[PDB]
Amino acid sequence: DAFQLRQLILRGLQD
Amino acid sequence: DAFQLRQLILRGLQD
Amino acid sequence: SLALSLTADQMVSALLDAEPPILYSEYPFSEASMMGLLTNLADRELVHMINWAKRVPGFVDLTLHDQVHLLECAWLEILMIGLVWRSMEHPGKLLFAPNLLLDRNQGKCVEGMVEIFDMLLATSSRFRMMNLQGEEFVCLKSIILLNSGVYTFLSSTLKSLEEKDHIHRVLDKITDTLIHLMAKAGLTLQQQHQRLAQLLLILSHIRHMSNKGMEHLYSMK
Amino acid sequence: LALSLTADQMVSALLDAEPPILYSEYDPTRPFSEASMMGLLTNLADRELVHMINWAKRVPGFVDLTLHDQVHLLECAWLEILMIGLVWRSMEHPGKLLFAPNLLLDRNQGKCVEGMVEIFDMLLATSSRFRMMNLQGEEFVCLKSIILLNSGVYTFLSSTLKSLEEKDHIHRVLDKITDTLIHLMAKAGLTLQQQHQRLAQLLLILSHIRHMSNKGMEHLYSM
Numbered sequence: 001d002a003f004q005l006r007q008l009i010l011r012g013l014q015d
Numbered sequence: 016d017a018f019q020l021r022q023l024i025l026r027g028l029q030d
Numbered sequence: 031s032l033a034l035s036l037t038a039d040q041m042v043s044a045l046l047d048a049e050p051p052i053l054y055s056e057y058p059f060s061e062a063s064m065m066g067l068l069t070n071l072a073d074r075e076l077v078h079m080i081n082w083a084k085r086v087p088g089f090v091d092l093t094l095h096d097q098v099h100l101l102e103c104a105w106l107e108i109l110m111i112g113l114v115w116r117s118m119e120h121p122g123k124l125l126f127a128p129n130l131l132l133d134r135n136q137g138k139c140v141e142g143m144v145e146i147f148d149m150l151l152a153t154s155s156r157f158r159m160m161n162l163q164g165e166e167f168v169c170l171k172s173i174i175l176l177n178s179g180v181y182t183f184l185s186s187t188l189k190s191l192e193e194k195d196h197i198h199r200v201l202d203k204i205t206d207t208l209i210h211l212m213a214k215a216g217l218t219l220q221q222q223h224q225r226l227a228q229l230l231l232i233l234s235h236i237r238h239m240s241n242k243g244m245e246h247l248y249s250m251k
Numbered sequence: 252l253a254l255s256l257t258a259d260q261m262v263s264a265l266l267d268a269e270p271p272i273l274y275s276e277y278d279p280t281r282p283f284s285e286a287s288m289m290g291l292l293t294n295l296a297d298r299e300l301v302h303m304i305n306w307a308k309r310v311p312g313f314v315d316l317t318l319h320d321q322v323h324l325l326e327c328a329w330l331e332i333l334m335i336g337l338v339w340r341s342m343e344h345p346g347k348l349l350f351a352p353n354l355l356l357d358r359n360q361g362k363c364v365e366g367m368v369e370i371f372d373m374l375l376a377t378s379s380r381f382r383m384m385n386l387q388g389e390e391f392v393c394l395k396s397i398i399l400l401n402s403g404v405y406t407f408l409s410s411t412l413k414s415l416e417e418k419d420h421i422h423r424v425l426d427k428i429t430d431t432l433i434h435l436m437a438k439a440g441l442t443l444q445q446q447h448q449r450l451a452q453l454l455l456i457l458s459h460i461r462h463m464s465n466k467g468m469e470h471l472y473s474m
């Protein structure tokens with residue numbers, strides 16, 4: 001959940 | 016380690 | 031720059047309108063089920079926090095890399111300030127959700143959790159004693175987002191210079207807004223500067239709670 | 252005594268309270284000898300701590316608290332206080348940390364200890380930020396006392412009457428230090444707007460210092 005945080009943040013921002 | 020800090024502070028505040 | 035053109039009233043409106051929805055929990059405890067319920071809630075709030083960040087003036091002017099970094103540094107602080115705000119009218123209790131209201135004895139259900147519960151309760155008390163207003167809350171929550179990662183970008187790079195300058199200018203706008211609320215409410219200049227200081231000093235306590243929290247969370251993994 | 256001070260008096264009290272600037276044991280005329288970075292930094296931190304305690308007693312308000320709370324404040328704040336002192340004396344040395352006047356270390360000396368460079372960079376970024384703001388000595392001494400008084404205030408007991416009185420007293424002294432900061436800014440020419448803005452800027456840096464201190468403890472404990 002250190003990698004899964006950044007992806008979760010990434011997806012929310014570009015969409 | 017955490018004891019050594021409390022000791023130091025208690026010494027300094029008292030005399 | 032839309033963000034730097036806003037009046038205080040406009041900033042407050044933008045921030046009030048940006049607010050994410052108040053989420054309900056899925057709610058006989060254990061360490062696992064309570065952490066299960068709190069984890070579920072944190073993760074669902076995080077999805078809404080991201081959308082909220084995009085609505086904070088200034089935020090989307092930054093690069094994607096820095097937008098990510100700010101949320102990565104701030105997310106637990108933001109969860110915590112939300113908790114502490116909605117817990118204000120429930121002394122002795124933390125209102126994780128309207129259907130999930132916990133006291134310090136349920137904190138003890140999870141090893142190492144009570145210390146942080148007590149800190150969160152002490153912060154909620156402090157807001158109660160100060161009559162923290164909703165308008166002030168939304169300003170503080172944006173300060174946290176914009177401030178917590180700003181010192182740990184790269185440095186001596188031209189791009190970072192431009193990014194930090196922009197954040198500092200937006201933070202100055204949010205300060206002006208806070209003073210404006212206080213002046214509108216009747217406070218003397220002296221009382222204005224004093225309350226502002228009091229509110230911002232509480233932010234370093236929230237930083238501390240977040241760091242202690244990450245430390246506690248990581249140690250369950 | 253503390254609540255009766257004028258701004259000028261508070262500043263004087265704080266300037267006068269300052270601890271000595273300490274020298275490292277490093278001998279620059281023996282550069283090719285085996286020297287231990289952590290050994291030298293530890294020796295310095297421990298000697299500063301002895302002086303920090305005596306400094307705390309000279310901060311207005313501090314000795315009015317109970318002994319238990321005096322201990323607690325220093326226990327929560329000591330690394331923040333070491334760090335803000337480092338950062339202050341490093342302001343006129345961009346790219347370097349002035350741990351002592353005879354121990355001026357380049358950024359890259361961070362790499363000598365595993366996990367130390369991240370914190371060095373954070374310290375350097377803070378020193379930069381003070382430089383960019385032209386932080387004044389008067390402002391620095393105010394900030395250092397705020398750290399002492401504010402860092403442990405939230406984590407006493409709570410719902411006990413004694414803590415209520417202790418916190419009330421701290422909050423009143425903190426209010427006095429804020430008044431003092433604003434006074435320095437007003438005296439220096441800033442508009443009201445500029446005063447509130449700079450005050451906010453300074454206090455927001457304090458939460459970065461808290462963060463560095465927490466990262467520091469985490470790094471120290473792991474050695």
Ligand SMILES: O=C(c1ccc(OCCN2CCCCC2)cc1)c1c(-c2ccc(O)cc2)sc2cc(O)ccc12
Nearest residue numbers: 001004005068069071072076109110113143146243246
């Ligand atoms: O219990 C939690 C909590 C539980 C799980 C979390 O994270 C799960 C990991 N997840 C992985 C994907 C990225 C986002 C986090 C975060 C907070 C909350 C908090 C906490 C309190 C004390 C403590 O020692 C640690 C945390 S504070 C909080 C506020 C909320 O609004 C919701 C949950 C919470």
Ligand SMILES: O=C(c1ccc(OCCN2CCCCC2)cc1)c1c(-c2ccc(O)cc2)sc2cc(O)ccc12
Nearest residue numbers: 019020292293295296300333334337367370467470471
């Ligand atoms: O190098 C040190 C340092 C070394 C040892 C310390 O503590 C040793 C244990 N000692 C035991 C008795 C209680 C007090 C601490 C503290 C700081 C300094 C710092 C540091 C930087 C990064 C990091 O990850 C950790 C620390 S900052 C600092 C400022 C100073 O003025 C002096 C030393 C220092």
